[PDB]
Design a protein around this nucleic acid. Sequence first.
RNA 1: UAAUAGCGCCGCAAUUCAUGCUGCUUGCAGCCUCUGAAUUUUGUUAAAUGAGGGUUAGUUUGACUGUAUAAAUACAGUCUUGCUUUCUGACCCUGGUAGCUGCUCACCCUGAUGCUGCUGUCAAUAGACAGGAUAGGUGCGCUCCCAGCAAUAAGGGCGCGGAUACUGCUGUAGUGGCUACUGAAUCACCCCCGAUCAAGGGGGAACCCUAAAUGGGUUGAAAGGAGAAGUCA
Lengths: 138, 560
Amino acid sequence: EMLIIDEADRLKPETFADVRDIAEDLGIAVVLVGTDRLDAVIKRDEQVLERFRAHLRFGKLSGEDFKNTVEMWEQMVLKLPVSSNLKSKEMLRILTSATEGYIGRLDEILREAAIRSLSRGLKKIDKAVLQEVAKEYK
Amino acid sequence: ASQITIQARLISFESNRQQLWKLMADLNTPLINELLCQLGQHPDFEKWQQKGKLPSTVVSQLCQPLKTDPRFAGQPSRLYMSAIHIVDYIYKSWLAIQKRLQQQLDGKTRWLEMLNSDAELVELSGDTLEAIRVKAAEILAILSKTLFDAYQETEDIKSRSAISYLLKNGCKLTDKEEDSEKFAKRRRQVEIQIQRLTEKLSLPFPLVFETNEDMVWSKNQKGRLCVHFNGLSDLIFEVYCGNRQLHWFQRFLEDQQTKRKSKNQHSSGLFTLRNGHLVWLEGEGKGEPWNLHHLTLYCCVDNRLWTEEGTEIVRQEKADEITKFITNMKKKSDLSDTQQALIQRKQSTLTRINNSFERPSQPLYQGQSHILVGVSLGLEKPATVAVVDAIANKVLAYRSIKQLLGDNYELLNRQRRQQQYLSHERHKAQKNFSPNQFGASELGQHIDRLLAKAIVALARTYKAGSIVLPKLGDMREVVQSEIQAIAEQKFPGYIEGQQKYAKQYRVNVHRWSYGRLIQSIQSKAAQTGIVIEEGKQPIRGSPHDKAKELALSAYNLRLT
RNA sequence: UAAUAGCGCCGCAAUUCAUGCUGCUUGCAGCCUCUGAAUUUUGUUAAAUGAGGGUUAGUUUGACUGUAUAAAUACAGUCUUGCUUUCUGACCCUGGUAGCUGCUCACCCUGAUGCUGCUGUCAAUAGACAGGAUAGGUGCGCUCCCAGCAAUAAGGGCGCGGAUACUGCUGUAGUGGCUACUGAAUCACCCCCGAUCAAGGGGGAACCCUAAAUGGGUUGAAAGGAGAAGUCA
Ligand SMILES: Nc1ncnc2c1ncn2[C@@H]1O[C@H](COP(=O)(O)OP(=O)(O)OP(=O)(O)O)[C@@H](O)[C@H]1O
């Protein structure tokens, strides 16, 4: 029913004809995923641009919802004995300062800090290791 | 350094102007012409071209046996010294271009004879470039002015080739240990340029009066201001200025009288007048030259000396540069006769500098440069600004070109239309054509000044400490990239349409004049007191975003 | 008759926003009402653009001192000169007579960043005569497009002569440039006499103050750095 082509800025212009053909004859919803470069990639396409025009931009996530996500990563993914950290405005300033809202960076930073702190024996995450990963990104 | 020039026409009798035209057009300019030719055929000429310093006294030495010449005699001492000075500085710029051309030709002949390709480098020198390149890199990158001078000095085939390779390869951590193309293209471009250089190996001059007092001021019996110059006191000219420039001239007479009334206890040298040219403008019509062309004074006035508070700044600059001059001359033991006269004049100025004339009272504004007005230059928008905080990351206020040129926008539109028309006419002019100034004006300069005034005023409103401007060198790449960005913005991937639209855009939206704008902003900001820094304009983004990021990059580099 | 389309501008929307607006909640919430920004998106019975050539030491943007005012700015006082510019008006014009010169044309064909293109009037000739900046096309322009011409782009063809680098077929013929003298405006509320390397002097009007006194006032505004040389294109 649906053909999700992830990283759909890679495939050559001469295969958009075949994905057009698939969507054209089989009645299959083709969903092209990709960085913004994909849009320019189809911009050159004359029908690909017409056929694939409904879109859904990924949110940047910044704001109170970002604050929720931060705490949501503590419980769901970090899985540590509760340390009463609670991602206070300090850690939030650090993470807004460091990640710029990208979920990847939120994940990359938190996993690194957790691994570092557990490798050095620290049971929870200190402000020290948070400053460490912050500087070593930017 | 806030030197500015005011001007005023000089009106006098026809006989008073026949003397000045004949004295200059028939005897003073020919002295400059001969002084220029002689300074060229001087044996040490090629020694000068290697340096940037023509000797202090050489132009004077060639003029002393020239003052008594049958065709260069009767010139007032100021006329003679002006001509000498003209030869030093008019021929200064002349021989500066001369040694650019002459010494460039010499170096091209030399680089052509010595510099070589990678193949000939291996054949003759045959040194491994990676090793010596990395060695020089750890020598220089690990005061680098000495190292760069050493690169400027090393000329042996292996040494110059390797050091230039290191310089053009990045002189840093580059993972591509390659590109003998550096000295390959060096020698190739040298051969082309040496081929080129082997194939190609009605208004009198002004009167610069380097002394302020050579112009003696007086008030006419009708109250008008009058001038007569040193060496020509029988020639009296009446200052026909404009009321905007009048307070300078009334200051000149007042300053000169103030020194007179103190029995020369006051230092001419804190005068609001520093020097003055005496040029002839060009008139329209016919007639003897003195009756057509308008004699004009161009007084260079240090605007900083107008206020009494500003004078103390000048009083401190001169009292610091001159007390250093004394110490510099006090170490020598030569003790020449006229040298001690020069020493004597110095301490005379220091004593005379602490006698203050009456000037207006102004609390010179103190500027904190942390605020960074960022100015972005482009094609689609000729100029946009962004007043942004650096400690924070918020933009206080943007302004676009339609908003800085208040009521001056129709001027920008009609100037773009005029620059289109004049460019089409110049292209239609081909090679054979009448003078191309037909229909030209200085509307571009008026707009480049209206824009600078508005930008500086905006900076002053928000207490901005510095105005940031793009480096002028990166103003061809920036405009080319902006044209490309607009092209892909209009036509996404249709390359034919992109090229066609780029052509049609270059037809209509011509390149701005990003030299006069950067210069006018530099003048206006320096006059007001706002220092100017330079950053790197981002390649893409919206003009407001480009301005903001330029301003932030400037502060980031200032942090260094 | 035609100007399609393109490209640049200018509005007019529409949306999104803040550099706004609003609110304190004081850095968030709305809002698009002004002001902007950023899109896109039309060309409305219209909004704003708007490119034929000229004319003023034009007016305004000013200095000092004092006051209010932190300053700006205001106000009062005193002084005032005309420079070099950018506009906005207003007005004038669509030039003549003399010379000296430049180019281009045998004849075709394509058609250039090529030239021309207004309104009447009389011809309807190719030109006058009156007007006249609204001036082919689009809201407004263009090197775009349309219409004519195209020898004066470039290219191709191609006749006769002479030469055997190239010429001639060429009439002021068509278009340029230069000089000399002339035509009009010569201004900034208007009119007149004047200066213009200097010069202002008069006479009106409207309005405002003032009942009314050429009593006084007012009858568009802005910006400054100039010279010289060289290089590139
Ligand atoms: N639902 C999720 N749970 C946990 N981590 C997530 C989630 N979504 C995203 N991330 C994390 O956020 C980061 C985003 O990486 P990801 O590969 O998804 O990026 P992307 O934007 O899809 O990349 P690309 O543009 O190359 O396709 C990763 O570190 C990923 O693990």
